[PDB]
Amino acid sequence: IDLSALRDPAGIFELVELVGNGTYGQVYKGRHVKTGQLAAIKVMDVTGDEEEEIKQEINMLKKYSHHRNIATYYGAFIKKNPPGMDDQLWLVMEFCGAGSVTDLIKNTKGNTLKEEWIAYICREILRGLSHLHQHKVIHRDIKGQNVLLTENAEVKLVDFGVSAQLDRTVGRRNTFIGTPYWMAPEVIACDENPDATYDFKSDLWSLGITAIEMAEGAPPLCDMHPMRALFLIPRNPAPRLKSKKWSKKFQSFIESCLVKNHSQRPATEQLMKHPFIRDQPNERQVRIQLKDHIDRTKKKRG
Ligand SMILES: CC(C)(O)c1cnc(N)c2nc(-c3ccnc(F)c3)ccc12
Numbered sequence: 488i489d490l491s492a493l494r495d496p497a498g499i500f501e502l503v504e505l506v507g508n509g510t511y512g513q514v515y516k517g518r519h520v521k522t523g524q525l526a527a528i529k530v531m532d533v534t535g536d537e538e539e540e541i542k543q544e545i546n547m548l549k550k551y552s553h554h555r556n557i558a559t560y561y562g563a564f565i566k567k568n569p570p571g572m573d574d575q576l577w578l579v580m581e582f583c584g585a586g587s588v589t590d591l592i593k594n595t596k597g598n599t600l601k602e603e604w605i606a607y608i609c610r611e612i613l614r615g616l617s618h619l620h621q622h623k624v625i626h627r628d629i630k631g632q633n634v635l636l637t638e639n640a641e642v643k644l645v646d647f648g649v650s651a652q653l654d655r656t657v658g659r660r661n662t663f664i665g666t667p668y669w670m671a672p673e674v675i676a677c678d679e680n681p682d683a684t685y686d687f688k689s690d691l692w693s694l695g696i697t698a699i700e701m702a703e704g705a706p707p708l709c710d711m712h713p714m715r716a717l718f719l720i721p722r723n724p725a726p727r728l729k730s731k732k733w734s735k736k737f738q739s740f741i742e743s744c745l746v747k748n749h750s751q752r753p754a755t756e757q758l759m760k761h762p763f764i765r766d767q768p769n770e771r772q773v774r775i776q777l778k779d780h781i782d783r784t785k786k787k788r789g
């Protein structure tokens with residue numbers, strides 16, 4: 488890509504406010520100057536050292552974010568600064584006004600979501616992942632914070648900042664990256680074993696952890712230092728839901744994502760056939776319930 492070809496955003500997009508109290512770093516609520524359309528705008532310095540990472544992120548946004556379960560890319564802008572000073576890059580995308588899944592859990596009594604909500608959100612994440620995996624992309628940072636909701640309760644993935652683009656379906660990677668509590672054992676192995684590798688199945692493990700996060704309010708081992716969780720994830724039994732209150736169908740779905748040996752872990756197509764994902768006869772009411780929660784939360788703040 489050509490960063491020099493990018494337009495200055497003045498008169499096109501404007502920054503309104505930093506989002507989520509800094510939880511996502513330099514991500515802003517923005518607005519189109521002419522139409523008033525909202526957007527999320529990620530702001531970064533263009534240093535010569537992060538060129539490959541910036542290119543990977545723009546390429547993912549440009550090529551794959553049109554899918555209904557990914558927050559859509561609107562374009563990129565550059566604020567040029569004088570010689571010796573770093574230019575700033577803006578990546579502009581769809582604004583998911585209802586916030587994250589982590590926020591949904593925080594704003595729900597008992598910090599636990601109903602199974603029917605978890606089935607709906609997991610299916611939408613799996614559809615977004617299936618689209619990415621079909622295009623040889625590994626997201627590598629699936630977690631509740633990167634799963635957002637629109638005001639209409641549509642589910643959208645964000646943040647391609649640590650993603651990978653493979654050359655073949657069976658392609659492998661070895662970068663130790665991601666968020667510890669959600670990381671698959673085979674990704675964790677790359678920190679201390681230089682010969683260890685992984686593949687796209689790592690995203691399905693992260694999805695299973697995200698489902699536990701929605702059910703129990705936090706991923707397993709959340710109450711421990713991340714270095715201790717990294718030590719335990721490869722050696723502990725695969726996580727399961729603690730309570731037997733959950734349906735056997737949901738318990739079975741978690742048992743399916745959370746296979747430690749990734750060679751034996753299912754891909755998205757096999758997981759989307761699971762009865763927990765496949766059978767959703769109340770999805771219309773789930774979306775009404777989610778929209779009612781969204782509307783109430785918006786009113787409660789002021
Ligand atoms: C309302 C909310 C939860 O603050 C929001 C809303 N809409 C978005 N698209 C957001 N996007 C990101 C995001 C994070 C990392 N890399 C990105 F490319 C985008 C973060 C927050 C977003």
Ligand SMILES: [Mg+2]
Nearest residue numbers: 552553554557
């Ligand atoms: Mg989209």
